[PDB]
Amino acid sequence: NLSMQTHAARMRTFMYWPSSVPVQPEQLASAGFYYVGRNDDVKCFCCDGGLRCWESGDDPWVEHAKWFPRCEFLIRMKGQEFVDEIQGRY
Ligand SMILES: CN[C@@H](C)C(=O)N[C@H](C(=O)N1C[C@H]2CCCN2C[C@H]1C(=O)N[C@@H]1CCOc2ccccc21)C1CCCCC1
Ligand SMILES: [Zn+2]
């Protein structure tokens, strides 16, 4: 988990990511996620939030904010305003 603080390190976890999942490693790693090595389960290096069952059209930053809105990495990258909006606070 400490070794997942860099984008390149998270990317390397996707070596055996199934090609049929309709979400790409690059999008996932950019949003703080790394592959835990089973099915399509990923976790955030910062908040330890886990996501799975990726769907066509999913945006990992939106999903991050939907489910883990207090994540500090998410807040620092996208800002509190983005998070509030995803949470339906205007
Ligand atoms: C459809 N888009 C995906 C990203 C999505 O919304 N996934 C949800 C999810 O990952 N969630 C849902 C939220 C609800 C409360 C917090 N949950 C976090 C996350 C989830 O299910 N994570 C599991 C929890 C058990 O531990 C792990 C470990 C690794 C990966 C995922 C999870 C799914 C899960 C499976 C069926 C449909 C919703
Ligand atoms: Zn997070």
Side-chain angles (χ1 to χ4, degrees):
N1 191 206
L2 281 180
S3 45
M4 299 293 130
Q5 288 173 300
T6 70
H7 179 90
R10 296 192 295 278
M11 278 301 292
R12 290 191 302 270
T13 68
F14 291 95
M15 168 83 197
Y16 301 113
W17 180 251
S19 77
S20 57
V21 183
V23 178
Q24 293 297 102
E26 166 73 8
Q27 314 173 249
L28 290 166
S30 285
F33 302 109
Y34 63 91
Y35 187 37
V36 308
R38 72 195 56 87
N39 294 332
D40 66 340
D41 299 356
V42 302
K43 292 195 112 151
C44 172
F45 83 91
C46 181
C47 69
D48 201 40
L51 295 177
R52 64 159 55 124
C53 297
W54 296 91
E55 281 191 341
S56 162
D58 273 350
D59 176 326
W61 277 124
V62 170
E63 298 301 306
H64 209 144
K66 192 186 183 208
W67 301 121
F68 314 113
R70 301 174 291 158
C71 173
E72 190 62 16
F73 170 74
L74 162 68
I75 287 160
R76 292 181 115 104
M77 297 296 284
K78 298 296 291 206
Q80 189 63 71
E81 189 171 318
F82 173 82
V83 182
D84 285 343
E85 298 218 347
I86 299 301
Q87 292 291 323
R89 297 163 209 144
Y90 290 106

